[PDB]
């Protein structure tokens, strides 16, 4: 009949699809390119801007911009280009026919939701929509009603404790560390070894290096002692021009800055200490049930060994007599989408949508009272 669209804007990848199917059928980077060189050949069909995988294919000749930075949409016309491309090109569905479900990080400005709703109603003319919290959807995705979700995409990291379906909004922690600034750190440490990656395309090469070769050390000092004392840890990667580059302690040393943000120069504690300091803000009767479920979400939690490092140092911080259990399903990169796909298909949820009648009556202000 009619099936809601489910869209998660993220930073980096857009992933989108229809409610009640199990994985997104559109996935592509939320990136817009504009050509920067003088075009020479007449009659080429040359185009004003490129979106998604087009801008990845041609990225040699493009300036690449991300329209979302730390979960805040900074540039709105490019975000409208990304949604226009998503609905018409990727899904090939007319948005007037389908409710749309949209996903956001907690504690980000309200103007972002007001503009997202004004755009979805006025330009797209979407009949109904909703804005959902990224972390809440990872519980729907992992089959739980209780747990402290740790979520990290590109941009924002946040912890959200939930207990039997009640959020605890005073205990929500948010951190801007994750994912892009790891790449801007890797580009800085790789220069030490004599490699220089400046352009926005070279940043995409370093992002691919990070996704292939980085891993998290169980003990950071033992492994720096080992990699100073050996070649055994060292891996080599082939650049798109067929050069070959060799990467040593940098590969474990890059994601350690998740646990020691002072490397990039932040003043806040690592994700393990924001997790523990988030559990410490919950009332003592429920802490046992948060230690028994920790749910990792989003791509920045994909590094090998990040679960066992998290469990090791949280088990160091926690009182000795409790199970600490870290839950990290291999699919977790899509968990926020799978959770929104579940949520949008419930029958109880069909009264939750903001309808255009209500937007017309109350204006975009309504989103704050109706949505979370």
């Amino acid at each position: 009949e009619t099936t809601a669209l489910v869209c998660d804007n993220g930073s980096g990848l857009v992933k989108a699809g229809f409610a009640g199917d199990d994985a997104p059928r559109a996935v592509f980077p939320s990136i817009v390119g504009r050509p920067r060189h003088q075009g020479v050949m007449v009659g080429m069909g040359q185009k004003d801007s490129y979106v998604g995988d087009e801008a990845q294919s041609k990225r040699g000749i493009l300036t690449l911009k991300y329209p979302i930075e730390h979960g805040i949409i900074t540039n709105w016309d490019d975000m409208e280009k990304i949604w226009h491309h998503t609905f018409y090109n990727e899904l090939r569905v007319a948005p007037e026919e389908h409710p749309t479900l949209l996903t956001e990080a907690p504690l980000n400005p309200k103007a972002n939701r007001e503009k997202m709703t004004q755009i979805m109603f006025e330009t797209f003319n979407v009949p109904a929509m909703y804005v959902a919290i990224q972390a809440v959807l990872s519980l729907y995705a992992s089959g739980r009603t209780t747990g402290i979700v740790l979520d990290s995409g590109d941009g924002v990291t946040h912890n959200v404790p939930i207990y039997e379906g009640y959020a605890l909004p005073h205990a929500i922690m948010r951190l801007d560390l994750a994912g892009r600034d790891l790449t801007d750190y890797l580009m800085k440490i790789l220069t030490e070894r004599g490699y220089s990656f400046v352009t926005t395309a070279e940043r995409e090469i370093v992002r691919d290096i990070k996704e292939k070769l980085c891993y998290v050390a169980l003990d950071f000092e033992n492994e720096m002692a080992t990699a100073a004392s050996s070649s055994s840890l060292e891996k080599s990667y082939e650049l798109p021009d067929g050069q070959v580059i060799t990467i040593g302690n940098e590969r474990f040393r890059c994601p350690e800055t998740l646990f020691q943000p002072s490397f990039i120069g932040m003043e806040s504690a690592g994700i393990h200490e924001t997790t523990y300091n988030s559990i410490m803000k919950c009332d003592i009767d429920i802490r046992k049930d948060l230690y028994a479920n920790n749910v990792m979400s989003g791509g920045t939690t994909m590094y090998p060994g990040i679960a066992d490092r998290m469990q090791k140092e949280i088990t160091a911080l926690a009182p000795s007599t409790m199970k600490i259990k870290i839950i990290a399903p291999p699919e977790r990169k899509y968990s926020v989408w799978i959770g929104g796909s579940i949520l949008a298909s419930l029958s109880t949820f069909q009264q939750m949508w903001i309808t255009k009648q209500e937007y017309d009556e109350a204006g975009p202000s309504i989103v704050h009272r109706k949505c979370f």
Binding site: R193, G194, Y195, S196, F197, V198, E202, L239, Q243, I245
Partner: peptide, 7 residues
Amino acid sequence: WXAXCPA
């Protein structure tokens, strides 16, 4: 250099 730039 050894990758990006020529030196």
